[PDB]
C-alpha cells in the first residue's frame, strides 16, 4: 500500500537520501515507531528544500496522528512551508490540516486519555499568521497575532516550541514596517528559548545576526551591544568579510573611539544602503553612547560643556544640541545650565554590567562601608549607659 509509494520516491531520490529512506520501511513494519521519529528528523535535515520531502510527509500525515508524537508531526510541516515558495500552496495546506486536528481531538483525547492534541492547534496557527506575512497581508496577520498571544498567556506552562513559533511570526512583522528597536527586543526573546534541535540552519542564524546588528547601530537606545558579543550569534559569526567591520563597529561604540567607527563606516556605507538612509542617526549614535557613559564612570553626576566638547569632537553649540536630543530620547534626565555651563544629570538609565563596571561600583562601596562602621563607633561611645 504505502510500501509501494515509499519505494517509488526512493527511486526518484538522490543516492544521498537513499540510506535514510530505507529506515522508514523497516520501522513501519516492525512497528517501532519511536525509531521512526528519529529517522524522520535525520532525513529532513539535509533534504529540507528537496521536493521529495513534502510528498513523503503527505503519506505519513494521513496514516498517523496519534501513533507518533503531536509535537513531532506538526513541526515538520512548519519547516516545509517556509521553504515552499508558493505561498498559496501554504495557506490552503494549513487550513485543511488544522480542521482535521480539531475534529480528531473530540474522540482521540479521551480514548488515549493521556495525550492532548490541542497543543497541535497553536503550532499550526502560528504558521497561518506567517503565511499572510509572505503574501504581504499585514492586516490579516495582526489579527491572528493578538489571538496567539492571549492563548500563550492562558496556559500556566508553555513548551519551548510554541513560544518559538510565536516569536517567529512577530519578527517577520516588525521588520516589514522597518522598525528597528521593536525588532531587536523580540529577537532576544526568540534566541534564548530556542530548541537545541537543528531545524534552524546556519543561514538563518547568520541572517538574524546581520539584522540584529543593523538594528543596534541604527537604533537609538540599544546599549545591550555587549550582549551580542557575549551571546553566540554575533561572537561566532565574525569570519566572513561582512562580519569583521560590522563586529568592530559594535566594539568601537563601547570604548567610544570616534575615529575608528567613522573610518570604517565611510567605506561600507556605499555598499549597503540600509545604513545609508539612516546616516544622521548612525553618526549621532556613537556620540549618544559616549555622553551617557562619561556620567556613569564618574562618581559625581555633572559635566562641563568643555569636557563634552573634547570627548565627542563637537563645538560648544553642538554640545548643547546633543544633550537636548539625548534627554528627548530619554537616555538622561536632569537640568541644563548654559549660564554655568554644566549639565547636572539626576538619573542615568540602567544598562548591562560587565567585569570592568563590576569593580568600579565595588570600589565605591568600600568607602561607604567604612563610613557606616566609624559613624557607628561614635554612637556606641555616647549613651553607652542608655541603651535600655
Amino acid at each position: 500500500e504505502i510500501d509501494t509509494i515509499l519505494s517509488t520516491l526512493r527511486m526518484e531520490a538522490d543516492p544521498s537520501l537513499h540510506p535514510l529512506f530505507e529506515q522508514f520501511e523497516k520501522f513501519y513494519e516492525e512497528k517501532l515507531w519511536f525509531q521512526l521519529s528519529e529517522s524522520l528528523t535525520k532525513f529532513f535535515d539535509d533534504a529540507k528544500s528537496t521536493p521529495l520531502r513534502l510528498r513523503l510527509y503527505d503519506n505519513f500525515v494521513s496514516k498517523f496522528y496519534d501513533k507518533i508524537n503531536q509535537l513531532s508531526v506538526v513541526k515538520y510541516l512548519l519547516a516545509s512551508l517556509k521553504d515552499s515558495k508558493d505561498f498559496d500552496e501554504s495557506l490552503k495546506y494549513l487550513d485543511d490540516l488544522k480542521a482535521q486536528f480539531q475534529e480528531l481531538d473530540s474522540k482521540k483525547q479521551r480514548n488515549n486519555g493521556s495525550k492532548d492534541h490541542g497543543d497541535g492547534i497553536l503550532l499550526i496557527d502560528s504558521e497561518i499568521a506567517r503565511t499572510y506575512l509572505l503574501k504581504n497581508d499585514l492586516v490579516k496577520a495582526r489579527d491572528l497575532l493578538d489571538d496567539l498571544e492571549k492563548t500563550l498567556d492562558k496556559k500556566d506552562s508553555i513548551p519551548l516550541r510554541i513560544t518559538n513559533s510565536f516569536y517567529s511570526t512577530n519578527s517577520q512583522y516588525f521588520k516589514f514596517k522597518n522598525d528597528f528597536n521593536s525588532f531587536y527586543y523580540t529577537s532576544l526573546l526568540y534566541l534564548s528559548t530556542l530548541e537545541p534541535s537543528t531545524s534552524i540552519t546556519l543561514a538563518e542564524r547568520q541572517q538574524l545576526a546581520y539584522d540584529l546588528s543593523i538594528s543596534a547601530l541604527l537604533g537609538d537606545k540599544i546599549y545591550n551591544f555587549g550582549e551580542l558579543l557575549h551571546h553566540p550569534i554575533m561572537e561566532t559569526i565574525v569570519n566572513d568579510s561582512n562580519y569583521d567591520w560590522l563586529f568592530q563597529l559594535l566594539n568601537a561604540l563601547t570604548v567610544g573611539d570616534f575615529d575608528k567607527f567613522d573610518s570604517l563606516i565611510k567605506v561600507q556605507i556605499s555598499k549597503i544602503p540600509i545604513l545609508a538612509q539612516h546616516e544622521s542617526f548612525l553618526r549621532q549614535k556613537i556620540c549618544l553612547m559616549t555622553l551617557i557613559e562619561t556620567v556613569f564612570v564618574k562618581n559625581i553626576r555633572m559635566l562641563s560643556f568643555e569636557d563634552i566638547s573634547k570627548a565627542t569632537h563637537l563645538p560648544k553649540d553642538n554640545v548643547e544640541h546633543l544633550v537636548m536630543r539625548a534627554i528627548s530620547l530619554g537616555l538622561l534626565k536632569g537640568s541644563i545650565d548654559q549660564v554655568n555651563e554644566l549639565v547636572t544629570i539626576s538619573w542615568v538609565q540602567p544598562r548591562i554590567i560587565s567585569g570592568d563596571q563590576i569593580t568600579k561600583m565595588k570600589d565605591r562601596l568600600v568607602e561607604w562601608n567604612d563610613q557606616v562602621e566609624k559613624l557607628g563607633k561614635k554612637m556606641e561611645a555616647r549613651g553607652q549607659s542608655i541603651w535600655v
Binding site: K31, W33, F34, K67, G113, S114
Partner: protein, 197 residues
C-alpha cells in the same frame, strides 16, 4: 502470593506509542494494572495496590496504597506520556510508599513494566538492588523494552535481590509480536508464584 502490598510502576515514555503491542504500549499497560489488582484481591481481601509513574523528569507518587481500583485509574488519566522512566529514582519512590501500609504484616513488592531501554547505569542499580532485600522488597522486572535491542542489565538486578526470602524476584520477557501485553502478564505467575527460602 497472599498478604502482599505491591507498588506497580507503570513506565511512561516516548517509546509507549509503539505498535509493537496494540493499539499502543501505554494503553495495553492500562489493562494490565486492572488484572493484577483483582488477582491479589480474590486470593485474599487485605491486599492493597499503589500506583506510581515515570512521567516527569523525576517519577511521582499519584496514589498511595488503597483497596479501590478506581482511585488508581484517575491517576493514569492524570498522568502524561512525555517523561522517561528512570528505574533508580522509581525504586526509591516505591520503597517510601511501602513504609505506609494498611497493615504492616503485609510483604513488600515492586512490579515494574519496562518500555524504555535503561539509560541508567548498571552500577547505580546494583547498589539499589542490595538496598531492597534488607527490607524484604523483591522486584519483578516485566521486560518488553530491551526487546528493541539492548543488553540485559536486568540479569544482574534480579540476581542481586534473589536470596532466602519468600518474596521472590522474577524476570519475564514478553513476546515481541502482537499478542496483547496484559494477557501474557496475566497468564504468567503473579499468584502462582512461590517462595524461595
Amino acid at each position: 502470593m497472599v498478604l502482599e502490598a505491591t507498588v506497580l510502576v507503570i513506565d511512561n515514555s516516548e517509546y509507549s506509542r509503539n505498535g509493537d503491542f496494540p493499539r499502543t504500549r501505554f494503553e495495553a499497560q492500562i489493562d494490565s494494572v486492572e488484572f493484577i489488582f483483582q488477582a491479589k484481591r480474590n486470593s485474599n481481601p487485605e491486599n492493597t495496590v499503589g500506583l506510581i509513574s515515570g512521567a516527569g523528569a523525576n517519577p511521582r507518587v499519584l496514589s498511595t496504597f488503597t483497596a479501590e481500583f478506581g482511585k488508581i485509574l484517575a491517576g493514569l488519566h492524570d498522568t502524561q506520556i512525555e517523561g522517561k522512566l528512570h528505574m533508580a529514582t522509581a525504586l526509591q519512590i516505591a520503597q517510601l510508599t511501602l513504609k505506609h501500609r494498611q497493615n504492616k504484616v503485609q510483604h513488600q513488592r515492586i512490579v515494574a513494566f519496562v518500555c524504555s531501554p535503561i539509560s541508567d547505569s548498571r552500577d547505580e542499580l546494583i547498589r539499589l538492588a542490595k538496598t531492597l532485600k534488607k527490607n524484604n522488597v523483591a522486584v519483578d522486572i516485566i521486560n518488553f523494552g530491551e526487546i528493541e535491542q539492548n543488553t540485559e542489565l536486568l540479569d544482574e538486578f534480579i540476581a542481586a535481590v534473589n536470596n532466602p526470602q519468600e518474596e521472590t524476584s522474577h524476570l519475564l520477557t514478553v513476546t515481541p509480536g502482537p499478542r496483547l501485553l496484559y494477557e501474557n502478564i496475566a497468564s504468567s505467575p503473579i499468584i502462582l508464584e512461590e517462595g524461595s527460602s
